[PDB]
């Protein structure tokens, strides 16, 4: 007989755990280059994401990677869906909802329209 | 200083399950992994970011850790048929164990101080 454990916090802890590194820069391995600021973040994590960032990220070897970002990419919009791909979470204000959908559009992020918005 | 009041929302409730599920086909698949745990003579392929976030052992083993190719011997404390199930836990979030294997599986997860096994029906002694 077998003994089964499933743990509903588990996913999401590990996530966190990934966060709190991201924003200590501790154990990331890639810098992203978007609109000349600088991101750190685990190249696993973003691809795990977007068939986008899979394909960008996969090749890689050197040393200390970093990856500069195309133009229709934005600072503004990135910012927020970096952190959402960490979190599962997004919070946008009037200033930045727009750049993040577009962002998310190049990105390629399949269900991240208008229409996925509530209100708080 | 945000201008406009941030209250436009979206939260999934599937995201990290999805995330965990991609990083668990990278391991398989080993693409995209970053260390190789050498444990009682057998190969792992995983996240060096992973393991530190499912384990203090791991954490502390790997937090200067930021050479590219990263090999890492465990002791003898730490066996295959211990952390093997221990590993697949990390990456799925699902431990099964049997008669055969949950004492060498429990004190396997004791050594590495492994997170998210306190709501289990498992006793640590």
Not at 22 to 30: A, E, S, T
Not at 83 to 109: D, G, H
Request: charged residues 25%; glycine residues 4%; hydrophobic residues 40%.
């Amino acid at each position: 007989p077998m003994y089964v454990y499933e743990s509903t916090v588990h996913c999401t802890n590990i996530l966190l755990g990934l966060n709190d590194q991201r924003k200590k820069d501790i154990l990331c391995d890639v810098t992203l280059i978007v609109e000349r600021k600088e991101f750190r973040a685990h190249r696993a994590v973003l691809a795990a994401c977007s068939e986008y960032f899979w394909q960008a990220l996969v090749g890689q070897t050197k040393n200390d990677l970093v990856v500069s970002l195309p133009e229709e990419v934005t600072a503004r919009g990135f910012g927020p869906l970096l952190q959402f791909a960490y979190t599962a979470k997004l919070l946008l204000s009037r200033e930045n909802i727009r750049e993040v959908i577009r962002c998310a559009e190049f990105l390629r992020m399949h269900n991240l329209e208008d229409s996925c918005f509530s209100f708080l």
